[PDB]
């Protein structure tokens, strides 16, 4: 066993030592390797050539800034690669293609600004992909073409300006998608047409003004939609016709003014809703919403309060409806 | 037995007022008002909290026929609660406590049975954007004459704040800080 490193088995645990590069190994039949919280700044070509039998490799919290081409070559049996919390900003297009049995890839908390359209080609056994907390501004249309068995994708905390029409091609088995804390402006749900297995979609804390749906379709698998903390003021009357099995809808802290009865009549499978913090106008317009609440049989965690006119501010909708003779 | 910060409201009428900053005028779902007083008057208005310009919301504490009471409005309608079992204008010190939870109200004279009053149905719960506290009831045409101590309104010791020459406070009329 190499110096400064304790080895429980074929697993090598080399966390929290002052390693500026990967140590050469007396035993090359190691199954796992941990190099966490060292100060590695560079990954050489064929650096892990000795560790052929590696199944998981942890390189998190290192100052890695440059990754040479063919850095991970020969790691055919590798199924987990953690590269989070580094200073990586460029990745050669051939850097992951050899790693066929990869299942979990973490590239979060890095300085990536863009990704090569063929970076994730040939990762068919990939299940989870963490790209959280990067400075990506755009995303290649073909990036996920080969990601057949991916079911978790994290793109939160980036600088995504907007969504490509068919960027998601090949994510047919994706279940959970994280797009929160980006900089989206509008949402055209026709853009998610290719994600036919999605059950949860997180879009909170963007800058979303509009909710539209260009192509009519049925997203039968979507069950949870989190839109908390955007700037939503307008919603096309058919965007929830698309999600018949939607059971959790969160739209707190937006700029919603009211809701058409056409909208609310589609949201009947809901078990949980969130409508707090919106700019509700308490007048005859909210009757659609007020009546729905009486009819509703699901739950809502926080009370829904009027914002306009001023004399109704902060008062629960139903209390204000019955108190001011607004309906019926 | 009356000790605490106290103001003498003598003949001619008097008034202590507090002005909230324009932006921070609070809204409250519940209110807690406690005042220490002594008087011999048959009719007067002790404290009144009025909403900002353009709002009908208000809270008024007053004496009518020697009986202490409270009248308030969340927006829509007036709600009244009064201690009618007995009299408080005997000249001795009393502490009356008022409590509001939305439509509900509570009155309790010092060391007497508590009065609880619950409105029917569902009421408006919010007292909306409080602008001023007017202690004295001069502007209502029923100025108070006597001594007021330990006034408490939603965490504010207003009289104590007047005795500390708070910048917002405006002291007018025949009022003395004994
Ligand atoms: C205002 O008070 C009402 C009613 O007070 C109830 O009646 C009394 C006899 C006493 O038993 C009180 O403790 C009761 O609360 C409140 O409405 C009730 O609230 C409780 C608790 O939330 C609930 O169990 C009852 O079903 C409610 N009854 C009705 C008719 O709605 C109300 O919560 C109070 N409002 C505020 C803002 O505090
Ligand atoms: C470590 O490996 C490098 C090649 O990557 C080689 O040049 C060097 O001599 C090796 N050192 C030891 C001590 O094995
Ligand atoms: C790698 O990138 C170059 C761009 O210079 C591209 O032409 C080439 O096809 C890419 N190779 C693979 C295997 O993706
Ligand atoms: C969103 O819709 C509103 C009205 O429906 C429109 O005025 C606005 O321009 C739209 N936003 C964008 C970014 O197109
Ligand atoms: Ca009010
Ligand atoms: Zn070092």
Author numbering:
A (entry chain A): 34 to 361
B (entry chain B): 85 to 262
From the paper:
Neurexins (Nrxns) are a representative presynaptic organizer family and interact with several different postsynaptic organizers such as neuroligins (NLs), Cbln1–GluD2, and leucine-rich repeat transmembrane neuronal proteins (LRRTMs). LRRTMs are potent postsynaptic organizers that have been shown to instruct presynaptic differentiation. LRRTMs have a leucine-rich repeat (LRR) domain in the N-terminal extracellular domain, which is followed by a single transmembrane domain and a cytoplasmic region. Here, we present the crystal structures of human LRRTM2 LRR domain alone and that in complex with human Nrxn1β LNS domain at 3.15 and 3.4 Å resolutions, respectively.
We thus replaced His355 with Ala to weaken this intermolecular interaction and confirmed by SPR analyses that LRRTM2H355A and LRRTM2WT have similar affinities to Nrxin1β (–S4) (KD = 4.3 µM and 4.0 µM, respectively). We finally succeeded in the co-crystallization of Nrxn1β and LRRTM2H355A under the condition without malonate or citrate. The Nrxn1β–LRRTM2H355A complex structure was determined at 3.4 Å resolution. Nrxn1β and LRRTM2H355A form a 1:1 stoichiometric complex. However, Nrxn1β binds to the C-terminal cap of LRRTM2 with a buried surface area of 448 Å2 in the present Nrxn1β–LRRTM2 structure. A calcium ion is coordinated by the side chains of Asp141 and Asn212 and the main chains of Val158 and Ile210 in Nrxn1β (residue numbering is based on human Nrxn1β (–S4); Fig. 2b). Therefore, we concluded that LRRTM2 Glu348 interacts with the calcium ion via the coordinated water molecule. The comparison between the apo-LRRTM2T59L and Nrxn1β-bound LRRTM2H355A structures (rmsd of 0.42 Å for Cα atoms) indicates that no drastic conformational change of LRRTM2 occurs upon binding to Nrxn1β, except that the side chain of LRRTM2 Glu348 flips towards the coordinated Ca2+. Apart from the Ca2+-mediated interaction, a hydrogen bond is formed between Nrxn1β Arg206 and LRRTM2 Asp352. Phe357 of LRRTM2 hydrophobically interacts with Leu208 of Nrxn1β.
